Structures are given as C-alpha cells and as structure tokens.
Ligand binder design. Structure first.
Ligand SMILES: Cc1nnc(=O)[nH]c1Nc1cccc(C(F)(F)F)c1
Length: 255
C-alpha cells in the first residue's frame, strides 16, 4: 500500500478533514496512468501521536470491502504523510444536500438512507462499531450513490449511554444513524441548532426527540423514532433498518 510521492500529482483542495485539508489529485500508477484520487493530508504529522491516529484510519478502511464504503488506495508514510483514497466527486453529503435542496426528490433522500444502512449492516456483520455516524462523514460518489467516508465529542449525535457513560456499541451506532437519517431528510441541517451541547442530554432524558422533518413519510419518521429508544436493547439492528428502508424506498418510487 505504500505509494511513491512522485506518482501523485496534488490538485485542488476539495475540503477539510479532521486531521487537515483533503485534495483531489492524480495517481500515475502502473495499473492506470491517470487515476483520479482523493488525498488526505495531516497537519502536525511530525507528532507521532497525531500521525498514529491519522494512519489508523487507513488501516481501518483497508479491512472493508463494500459498495457504500470508500476504498483505500494507498499511503505515503514519509513527512508530509498522505492517505490516498477513492475520489467521490460530488463531495461531502451535507454540502451536497444544502446546495441541491430543491433539486433532490424524496426518493433520492430515502435512497441515501438505504445505502448507508447497507454499509452499516455490513459493519455490524463484522462486529465493528463506528462510533461517529453523522452526515458529515458521508461522501457522494454520484447523484444515486453515497458512501461512508471517514473513520470535541459529537454530543448532538450521541446515544444517551454514550454521553452519560462513554459506552459505544452497535446499539449506540443505531441511535446515531437515526440522527443521520434526520439530517438527510432535513437537507443537511444539523440536529439541535441553537442548543448548547450541555443541554442535549437533559432533553433526551425528558423524552424529547428531533421533530418530523417537513415532507418526511410517516413510516420513515417512525423508523427514526425506533432508533431513538432510550433503552439500547429496544433499538432495531441494521438488518431490520435496511429491510424497512428498502420497502419505504419502493413505496416512494411507486408514488
Ligand atoms: C476520504 C475521502 N475520500 N474520497 C473523497 O473524495 N473525499 C474524502 N474525504 C473528505 C473529507 C472531508 C471533506 C471532503 C470533501 F472534499 F469536502 F468532500 C472529503
């Protein structure tokens, strides 16, 4: 997986990552003389601590093979350290939804939820817990294809047991997925706008939940609400979410 730096032509900055800017570029490879790629960079990669955390993402992504999870292409492990990834040419999901708010039909939004559910059912099948499911970590490969894209706490997305006890499980991922579905159906609006991170848990404990997005199907909102059961053992698994989203999608496409 090590790639010679001379094989990479760094292009334009496409966005911001947790560790530094992400660029588009070209990988001039034996298999493909002009492969379009994304290049993740890391500020302060001279710190062993930071570099270990950065490159851990690449190690993680290398373990997965799924149509809706972004693929690792390789790494450059000399300063400045870079991770070379599959390029998703339509960019981050939140930006995409906000810009295309009035060009995306409901069927596409449900499709995106469904595709993410397929990725997360796959991770569940491997007993992998993601811990940070949110629209900010999803990328758009085509107008009909989204992918999970990325391996201070995201309190507004977290399950109550995660906030209270720092416990993350497959069940907490489902809660976060519920929030991510809400985000999609809200065209990339963040949950709990105007609320302080410290006041989120009080509202959750008081039985409050994110409201039904405008134009959201009732079957779909009901599914979200099931993801947000206080007791983790009452939340569905991703196999059930995927099946229900497929039926909802098909009902929408028949409309
Ligand atoms: C990991 C990855 N793989 N393929 C990509 O095409 N982009 C990626 N990451 C990423 C992270 C943050 C922001 C943005 C951007 F450019 F805004 F979309 C992209």
């Amino acid at each position: 997986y090590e790639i010679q730096r001379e094989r990479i032509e760094l292009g334009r900055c496409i966005g911001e990552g947790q560790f530094g800017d992400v660029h588009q570029g070209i990988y001039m490879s034996p298999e493909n003389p002009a492969m379009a790629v994304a290049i993740k960079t890391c500020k302060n990669c001279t710190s062993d601590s930071v570099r270990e955390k950065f490159l851990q993402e690449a190690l993680t992504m290398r373990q997965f093979d799924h149509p809706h999870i972004v693929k690792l292409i390789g790494v450059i492990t000399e300063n400045p350290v870079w991770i070379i990834m599959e390029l998703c040419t339509l960019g981050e999901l939140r930006s995409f939804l906000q810009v295309r708010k009035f060009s995306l039909d409901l069927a596409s939004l449900i499709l995106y939820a469904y595709q993410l559910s397929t990725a997360l059912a796959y991770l569940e099948s491997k007993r992998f817990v993601h811990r940070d499911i949110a629209a900010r970590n999803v990328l758009v490969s085509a107008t009909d294809c989204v992918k999970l894209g990325d391996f201070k706490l995201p309190i507004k997305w977290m399950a109550p047991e995660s906030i209270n006890f720092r416990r993350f499980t497959s069940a907490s991922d489902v809660w976060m997925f519920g929030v991510c579905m809400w985000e999609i159906l809200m065209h990339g609006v963040k949950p709990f706008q105007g609320v302080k991170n410290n006041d989120v848990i009080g509202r959750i404990e008081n039985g409050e939940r994110l409201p039904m997005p405008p134009n959201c199907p009732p079957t779909l909102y009901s599914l979200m609400t099931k993801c947000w059961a206080y007791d983790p053992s009452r939340r569905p698994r991703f196999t059930e979410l995927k099946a229900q989203l497929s039926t909802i999608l098909e009902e929408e496409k028949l409309q």
